Amino acid sequence: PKQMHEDYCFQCGDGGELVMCDKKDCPKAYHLLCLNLTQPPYGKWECPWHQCDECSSAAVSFCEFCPHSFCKDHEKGALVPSALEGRLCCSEHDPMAP
Numbered sequence: 193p194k195q196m197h198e199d200y201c202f203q204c205g206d207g208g209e210l211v212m213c214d215k216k217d218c219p220k221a222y223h224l225l226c227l228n229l230t231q232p233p234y235g236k237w238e239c240p241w242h243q244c245d246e247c248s249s250a251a252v253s254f255c256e257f258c259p260h261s262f263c264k265d266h267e268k269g270a271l272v273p274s275a276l277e278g279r280l281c282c283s284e285h286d287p288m289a290p
């Protein structure tokens with residue numbers, strides 16, 4: 193069946209209870225504990241993928257494996273292609289085995 197979000201946590205890869213990103217066309221979902229969330233957020237909740245991890249500005253480049261992402265100023269040397277279909281990965285993954 194079709195559903196708009198992934199069935200697994202984008203932080204740790206495991207399923208169960210997730211909070212789903214309310215940002216337009218974001219399929220990402222996360223365990224509460226995986227983001228230090230203490231309770232299911234109410235209202236419009238956008239996930240960390242959309243904010244640059246270095247500063248606070250909006251992300252324009254994205255790690256395809258975890259929610260690290262980077263604004264204009266911090267794209268350079270942040271993402272490289274990985275061995276998995278060339279998908280870009282942040283410095284937190286081995287690019288040979290992301």
Ligand SMILES: [Zn+2]
Nearest residue numbers: 201204223226
């Ligand atoms: Zn998780």
Ligand SMILES: [Zn+2]
Nearest residue numbers: 213215218239
């Ligand atoms: Zn999101």
Ligand SMILES: [Zn+2]
Nearest residue numbers: 244247263266
């Ligand atoms: Zn930034």
Ligand SMILES: [Zn+2]
Nearest residue numbers: 255258260282
């Ligand atoms: Zn990453």
